[model samples]
Target: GPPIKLRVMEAYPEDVGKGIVRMDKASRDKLGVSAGDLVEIKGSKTPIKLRVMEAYPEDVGKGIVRMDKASRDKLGVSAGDLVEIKG
Candidate 1:
């Protein structure tokens, strides 16, 4: 199983959670999964699980993972931090 690492970023207010997260398209290549799939987020040894949504083209290759403020707080992680992601 391939798990990938990504930097945490804030999702825009308009897009903020219905409990969903987004990731760089390029980054998905490493995980072998895509939009609508669920992923487990690992942070500070804690796990936060959620479904995926499509990321913007600008996000591609940036290794950015966008989570709304609610989930960001749930994970206790801030922007610029890195976390492990897997199914």
Candidate 2:
């Protein structure tokens, strides 16, 4: 399957830390992954491993991954940086 491509966005304070990746149901479906699943994000010098958090419908979209600051920095990505997620 094609890797799920999404632009990175910062997570809210309540959801920050712990290498969590927040995605809406639509986005999770596209990646063929589910909540509580582990997914790999790439597009940086090194890939980042994060737990999938299928969040509320408003949290993300089919091509968006809302990530913790730690996870974002780990992947060397910032807002608007594109990354690919794979199961």
Which candidate number has the best lDDT?
Answer: 1
lDDT of 1 by residue, 1-87 (tens): 488889989886767857777876676767877888889998864788878888877677788888887887788888889988996
Alpha-carbon RMSD, each predicted model: 1.4, 1.6
lDDT of 1 at 87: 65
How does each model score on lDDT? Answer: 0.81, 0.79
Model 1 lDDT at residue 76: 83
Judged by whole-model lDDT over C-alpha atoms, candidate 2 comes out at 0.79
Give the C-alpha miss distance for residue 69 in model 2, angstroms: 1.5
Error of 1 at 81 (Å): 0.2
